[PDB]
Amino acid sequence: MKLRGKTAVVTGGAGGIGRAVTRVFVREGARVLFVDVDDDRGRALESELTGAGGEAKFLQADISRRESADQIRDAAVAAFGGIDILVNNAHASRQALLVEHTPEMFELSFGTGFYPTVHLMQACYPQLKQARGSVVNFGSGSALDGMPTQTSYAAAKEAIRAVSRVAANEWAADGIRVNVVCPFAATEGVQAWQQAFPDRAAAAAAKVPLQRIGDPETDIAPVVVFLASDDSKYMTGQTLMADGGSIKLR
Amino acid sequence: MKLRGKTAVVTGGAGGIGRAVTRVFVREGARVLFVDVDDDRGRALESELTGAGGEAKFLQADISRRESADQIRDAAVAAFGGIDILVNNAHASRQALLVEHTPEMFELSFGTGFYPTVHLMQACYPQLKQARGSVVNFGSGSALDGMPTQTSYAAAKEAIRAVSRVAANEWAADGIRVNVVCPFAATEGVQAWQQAFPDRAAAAAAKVPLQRIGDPETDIAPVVVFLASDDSKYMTGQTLMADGGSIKLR
Ligand SMILES: NC(=O)c1ccc[n+]([C@@H]2O[C@H](COP(=O)([O-])OP(=O)(O)OC[C@H]3O[C@@H](n4cnc5c(N)ncnc54)[C@H](O)[C@@H]3O)[C@@H](O)[C@H]2O)c1
Ligand SMILES: NC(=O)c1ccc[n+]([C@@H]2O[C@H](COP(=O)([O-])OP(=O)(O)OC[C@H]3O[C@@H](n4cnc5c(N)ncnc54)[C@H](O)[C@@H]3O)[C@@H](O)[C@H]2O)c1
Ligand SMILES: [Ca+2]
Ligand SMILES: [Ca+2]
User: Fold this and answer.
1) Of A67, B32, B151, B230, which is most buried with the most CB atoms under 10 A?
2) Catalytic annotation on B153?
3) Which domain covers residue A204, as residue numbers?
4) Domain total for chain B?
5) DSSP string for residues in A95-136
């Protein structure tokens, strides 16, 4: 009942952290329109959530396209009448040294991570202002450190955090809060990275003070629920570290 | 519901933010031993909480006294059998320019804020280890900026945040998380500061993006509940800004 009566939009909601956000949000009483290009995982998640009596709607959409932001907003409004929560979770990237980077690498990272964050916030702003709602964007601890091979990934992530701080200041008068989560969780995207960079991945796992890679449902999603809920109604423009204590903000 | 079955120690728990934490903790199902020198407010709070069906115990103690840590730990165990949560909330200080600072100003700030935080963490460590518990310490945004007149207040606050990060690293293997809240709330200590420094207080009020000074119960305490609860079980060593967006950690 933490999000009872609230409507949430979750991008990349068919897998990884976005799937766990969708599951826990519905479990907390929220109506969720979750968006993904993966309709195999997307339709089965819709089937599982609606079977248990939850209100979830899958929308198959590539959020990197110009018309996706308005289609996502229109689909949430048509299905649930409003938008209280916007979780900009989806992001794709490629890892390579800076001297190895290509324009396609920046296009992927900014096109799937940064610009959908901006465009969905612009499209959903009237609905979020009506709801006095909450926007949860996603950063990364490796973008804070400057982890090697993360040129295009970290550039988009820190651009996401920058616009999150600007929007927090611009939208605070409307009662809309904007915050960032930096997670570390066992997802499909992390498993592919652990296979391509096993030494770096093992060093990252061994660094976690709490001695585990996060579970998306029990370690990451409750932090997103907190930011989407009225418990954080006096918190905006912040970055929450859901990483087992790996990086401590000062 | 959220802290059902948990025992909490809350210092300065009879007034201001500490009282809001004590109230809200009991509403979430926790058993609270709250400590304060204000026995008038302390006795009435205990009467109010037990009268509403809650479990709370008031301990009258000056936490700057060197035996109070063991007296507090023993009282919590004697009343409720263990310690799952430690909230180091009490802190008294005086404001003056650096060129106007006396040793008694440093003694008050360190003696009421910093050293009780260390000693209560040491005293409660066996109970927190048994519980795999959570420690919530308190900082200040004014210490982050270095606001004038805050030499002794900021020094103790940043010393608190330092030991919080050290213990988070040292205690993470035991499953004990340690985090900091930086609040901005309408309390009696803030009211006394508003009278002594009206222009600076007006400037601090006007800076808040969310355009209000925090209500202790609805704006500050739910952030403490989040850190004390299992929703933040993957978060340690962090600082949470409950300040309406005034300061954004990067
Ligand atoms: N998992 C981690 O440890 C970790 C670490 C740092 C940051 N993050 C951030 O957390 C968020 C979640 O990451 P994850 O590991 O769950 O990702 P993932 O790669 O495991 O899953 C991403 C999901 O988003 C969907 N998606 C990708 N591109 C899309 C597009 N253009 N349109 C619609 N849907 C699309 C995919 O189908 C997939 O379901 C990401 O923004 C990521 O940058 C995660
Ligand atoms: N209220 C704010 O805006 C604000 C801003 C920055 C930081 N903080 C921090 O938040 C915490 C709460 O502050 P507040 O505004 O509620 O303070 P306050 O002065 O309003 O309340 C302090 C409470 O602690 C008790 N106390 C003080 N010294 C004690 C001692 N030696 N032993 C036992 N009890 C003692 C007092 O009796 C009182 O009940 C403090 O640590 C403060 O530094 C608050
Ligand atoms: Ca876009
Ligand atoms: Ca002491």
Assistant:
1) B32
2) yes
3) 1-250
4) 1
5) -B-GGG--HHHHHHHIIIIIHHHHHHHHHHHHHHHHHT-EEE
